[PDB]
Amino acid sequence: HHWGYGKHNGPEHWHKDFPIAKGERQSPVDIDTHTAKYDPSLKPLSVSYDQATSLRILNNGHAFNVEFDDSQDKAVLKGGPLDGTYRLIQFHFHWGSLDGQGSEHTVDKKKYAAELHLVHWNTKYGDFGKAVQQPDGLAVLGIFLKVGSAKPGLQKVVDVLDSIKTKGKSADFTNFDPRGLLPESLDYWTYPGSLTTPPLLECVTWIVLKEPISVSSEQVLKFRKLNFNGEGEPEELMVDNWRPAQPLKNRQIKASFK
Numbered sequence: 001h002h003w004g005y006g007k008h009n010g011p012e013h014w015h016k017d018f019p020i021a022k023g024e025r026q027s028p029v030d031i032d033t034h035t036a037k038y039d040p041s042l043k044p045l046s047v048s049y050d051q052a053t054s055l056r057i058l059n060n061g062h063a064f065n066v067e068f069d070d071s072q073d074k075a076v077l078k079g080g081p082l083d084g085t086y087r088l089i090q091f092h093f094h095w096g097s098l099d100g101q102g103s104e105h106t107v108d109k110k111k112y113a114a115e116l117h118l119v120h121w122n123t124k125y126g127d128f129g130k131a132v133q134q135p136d137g138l139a140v141l142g143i144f145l146k147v148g149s150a151k152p153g154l155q156k157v158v159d160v161l162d163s164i165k166t167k168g169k170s171a172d173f174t175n176f177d178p179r180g181l182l183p184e185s186l187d188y189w190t191y192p193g194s195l196t197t198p199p200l201l202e203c204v205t206w207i208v209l210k211e212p213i214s215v216s217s218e219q220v221l222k223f224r225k226l227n228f229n230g231e232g233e234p235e236e237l238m239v240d241n242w243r244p245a246q247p248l249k250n251r252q253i254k255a256s257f258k
Ligand SMILES: NS(=O)(=O)c1ccc(CCNC(=O)Nc2ccc(Cl)cc2)cc1
Pocket: 117, 119, 129, 132, 140, 194, 195, 196, 197, 198, 199
């Protein structure tokens, strides 16, 4: 009886195994655009993905992860609210059963169809497992997806999904360029938070881009054909793998833009 996204094991149950679920800096949150304060001390984000080396795509039973070789300083996030250098390790998405839900963060209570998470770890801690134990260990770049025009840079991901339908399946996934998933503007909101899945560790500087990317209905429909279950088990479509907004508590969301 492990955690997941159902009546019996979904987000409202997680606190029993992971009491930090009711902690002081949990994610995601609703971004109230009127109360987020412009912070002129924030820097432009530096996204340096020219040398990113993708290796593999994995269905982990909760989402799919596109994994990168993070054994060198090949793809890094810097600047913005961050001190130092954060290395890209993987990206994944959260999405809905329908276009009206799926994102984890919300904007004035608006839910997007999906949300991309580009996960980076602080190189001062030497590796990912050590970084998640630190309050400034991770930087996750969050990008909203809306349904409209196709995102050409996503289609290589969409087309490999048939080969990792079920939990525990993986496939070679080299030479994927995540620059193709970025919107035009790097305007962002930022706040201190957590992993949005167990173990819910409070180790994340969240950087959420204001501008969504557009994907086609056919693209997101293919996400919704994945399975939470393993091969040969009863089919449970991988949809609604998002955690709802959590209490903001004593935190301030800062905007990089006027
Ligand atoms: N949805 S998200 O972007 O917030 C997000 C990003 C990354 C993860 C990482 C999962 N991996 C992990 O939990 N690693 C770990 C945990 C405990 C020990 Cl003891 C050792 C290693 C989860 C959520």
